[PDB]
């Protein structure tokens, strides 16, 4: 997307695995605020806009 048009997309009613993200072997500045990325997969929250 563009930064004049980064749309607030709603991906819903499915599941997103994050363990392949740590083994993607390409991340540069992977920054998690609030909760640690170790405890991201097991517990989830509402409002999962992207």
């Amino acid at each position: 997307a563009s930064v004049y048009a980064w749309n607030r997309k709603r991906i819903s009613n499915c599941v997103a695995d994050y363990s392949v993200l740590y083994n993607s072997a390409s991340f540069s500045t992977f920054k998690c605020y609030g909760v640690s990325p170790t405890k991201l997969n097991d517990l989830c929250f509402t409002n999962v806009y992207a």
Partner: nanobody
Framework: QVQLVESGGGSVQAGGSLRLSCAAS????????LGWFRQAPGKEREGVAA????????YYADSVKGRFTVSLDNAKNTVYLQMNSLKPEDTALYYC??????????????????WGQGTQVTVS
Amino acid sequence: QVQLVESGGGSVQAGGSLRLSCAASGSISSITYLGWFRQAPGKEREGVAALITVNGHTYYADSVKGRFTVSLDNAKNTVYLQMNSLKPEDTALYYCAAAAWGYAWPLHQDDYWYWGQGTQVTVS
């Protein structure tokens, strides 16, 4: 809440070998990322070595590429930094840093790290 104790420094000639260590104590399972720093006299503290604890992925700077190795020992709770093929531009104060938020390549000083006391490595 995370205390780092580092050792293994000393003086060695050019072409020699050294092996730094940095033991961790506290909330060990929350720490996801260990990075090694280096601050030369007259230069800014930059990023040299990097290691994700969960993934095992190693990241090295371009000035130390092909020479420097970082390894993790979960049983002794201590990250290592083996010094191979040393040159006299490596005379600096080295620092080990721990992160409980994730990984960031390149290393930056302004992020939140658990800082140690630093070890003097002098080569000539």
